[PDB]
Design a protein around this nucleic acid. Structure first.
Length: 82
DNA sequence: CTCCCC
């Protein structure tokens, strides 16, 4: 069916979770991009920020999928939550 | 930096 316009959403992640979404060699985020169909950009933190901004661009369904998969990626997160 | 992507 109709997926509608490509749109861009941003979400922030605590910087320490970023490694979980990216994965070794970027393998996780490559997968999430591939699976979701969404473009996904994870920035560096802005000057002295605890967050990184992820920009997700795709149809609403793709962005929705990407978000879910990014959230899911935390479950695999290998560092200290605090 | 699990650090990709550009």
């Amino acid at each position: 069916g109709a997926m509608g316009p490509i749109i861009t959403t941003q979400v922030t992640i605590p910087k320490d979770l970023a490694g979980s979404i990216i994965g070794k060699g970027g393998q996780r985020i490559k997968q999430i991009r591939h699976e979701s169909g969404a473009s996904i950009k994870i920035d560096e933190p802005l000057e002295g920020s605890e967050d990184r901004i992820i920009t997700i661009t795709g149809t609403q369904d793709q962005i929705q999928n990407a978000q879910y998969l990014l959230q899911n990626s935390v479950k695999q997160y290998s560092g200290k939550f605090f």
